[PDB]
Antibody, heavy 227, light 210 residues
Framework: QVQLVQSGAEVKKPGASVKVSCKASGYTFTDYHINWVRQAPGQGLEWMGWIHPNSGDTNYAQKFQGWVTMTRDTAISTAYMEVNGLKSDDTAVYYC???????????????????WGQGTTVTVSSASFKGPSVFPLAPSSKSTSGGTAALGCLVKDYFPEPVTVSWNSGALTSGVHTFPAVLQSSGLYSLSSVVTVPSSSLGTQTYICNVNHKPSNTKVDKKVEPK | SVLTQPPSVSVAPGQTARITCGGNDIGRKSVHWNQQKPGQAPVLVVCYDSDRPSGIPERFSGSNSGNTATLTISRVEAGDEADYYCQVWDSSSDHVIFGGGTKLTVLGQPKANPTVTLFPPSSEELQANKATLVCLISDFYPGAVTVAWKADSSPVKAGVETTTPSKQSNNKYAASSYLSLTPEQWKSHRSYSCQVTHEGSTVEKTVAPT
């Protein structure tokens, strides 16, 4: 079938360049335009331009002309998108797409996109492999049911995923809520884990979050006191 | 040239969803429609205003005339929940233009209001010359939410990072939002607030230094 096979995920430091590839299969490469579209996390589709593999002709979008370069290698049926001077706002999924929707009239002489690649993730960050800092989220009962309190642990600024959190070495599982990590402009991750416990137990029972970040070989057992 | 789409449309299963794509003289252009699900690449569901591509159910129908193109999805199923994009070529600029995208929500359970928990920066973090406010949001449906931060009754958008909603074990949604401050910023204002808007209602929590 008609497929576009895109290269793998990339982590780039600011200022670097990145060149992602888009290899065609299941059809003749020089028969259709290749369009490029990028999508920042949680945003919409953003057309970057197209290249015709037969002639090499390009049409750069206004927002991207001058700092991206579309090329192609017909010998190996591959198109390339190079992005230069990478900034944090260049973090996105970069799609290629075949322009298989031929025009129906000479009035609207446009070849539209039919088959899309799976996308190439590019994350621009000053991030290196980094263990997290763990801070306590001291108990409060303002948003929990009557007679219960919520306390937690802030696991801040780590890379890469994942971070696992347990409570009291696994003895405490009921009422534990570990929220999925946020990915920040720095390219570092942060997550929080909170457990809802009886208010009376705050004087009696000790609460420890067991944070494990294997990629940096960091472990923290943070005791969370009522303060 | 700009294509205007409503940011969101919500329907119950079996109902008919209608997604509009507004543009001047868009009836003269040929509109294609893309469907994108999370963990999906854009897929063609309508081509050439109204044509149905291969494999797409006949429930997916498009129309185009005047200043508005419309994607119509009859007998909506839960699998139709996705972001939909209209696309057009603008000859005067030689640009391919996508609409802003419409998130189609298929309402599979009653609305549930969010629970908001807000933690102030810890004293230990302040001693490390940092300050992070943690806003935790849970138990809401549908899984669409917008967070806004304020300080002394004034909007704050620098340093805000919000996750997208994620399903919980009880099949409701959860999310979190972080506000990174300096120790002086945290200590100089009255208070900061996390404002969570969900389905036209807002829940706001506020914390203050010491």
């Amino acid at each position: 079938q008609v497929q576009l096979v895109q290269s793998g995920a990339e982590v780039k430091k600011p200022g670097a360049s990145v060149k992602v590839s888009c290899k065609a299969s299941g059809y003749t490469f020089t028969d259709y335009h290749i369009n490029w579209v990028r999508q920042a996390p949680g945003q919409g589709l953003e057309w970057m331009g197209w290249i015709h593999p037969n002639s090499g002709d390009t049409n750069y979008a206004q927002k991207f002309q001058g700092w991206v370069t579309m090329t192609r290698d017909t010998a190996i049926s591959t198109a390339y998108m190079e992005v230069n001077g990478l900034k944090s706002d260049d973090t996105a999924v970069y799609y290629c797409a075949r322009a298989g929707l031929h025009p129906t009239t000479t009035e609207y002489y446009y070849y539209g996109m039919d088959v899309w690649g799976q996308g190439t993730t590019v994350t621009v960050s000053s991030a290196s492999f980094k263990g997290p800092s763990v801070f306590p989220l001291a108990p409060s009962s303002k948003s929990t049911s009557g007679g219960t309190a919520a306390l937690g642990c802030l696991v801040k600024d780590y890379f890469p995923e994942p971070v696992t959190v347990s409570w009291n070495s696994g003895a405490l599982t009921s009422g534990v809520h570990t929220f999925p990590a946020v990915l920040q402009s720095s390219g570092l991750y942060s997550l929080s884990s909170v457990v809802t416990v009886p208010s009376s137990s705050l004087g009696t029972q000790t609460y420890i979050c067991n944070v494990n970040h294997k990629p940096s070989n960091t472990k923290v057992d943070k005791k969370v006191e009522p303060k | 040239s700009v294509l205007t789409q409503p940011p969101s449309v919500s329907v119950a299963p079996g109902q008919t969803a209608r997604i509009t794509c507004g543009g001047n003289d868009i009836g003269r252009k040929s509109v294609h429609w893309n469907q994108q699900k999370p963990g999906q690449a854009p897929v063609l569901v309508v081509c050439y205003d109204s044509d149905r591509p291969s494999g797409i159910p006949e429930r997916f129908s498009g129309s185009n005339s005047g200043n508005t193109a419309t994607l119509t999805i009859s007998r909506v199923e839960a699998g139709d929940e996705a972001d939909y994009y209209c696309q057009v070529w603008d000859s005067s600029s030689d640009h391919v233009i996508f609409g802003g995208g419409t998130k189609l929500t298929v309402l599979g359970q009653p609305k549930a209001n969010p629970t908001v928990t807000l933690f102030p920066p810890s004293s230990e973090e302040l001693q490390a010359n940092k300050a992070t406010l943690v806003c935790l949001i849970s138990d809401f449906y549908p899984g669409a939410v917008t967070v806004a931060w304020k300080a002394d009754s004034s909007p704050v958008k620098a340093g805000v990072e919000t996750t997208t909603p994620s399903k919980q074990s009880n099949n409701k949604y959860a999310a979190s939002s972080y506000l990174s401050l300096t120790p002086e910023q945290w200590k100089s204002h009255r208070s900061y607030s996390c404002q969570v808007t969900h389905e036209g209602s807002t829940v706001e929590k506020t914390v203050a230094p010491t």
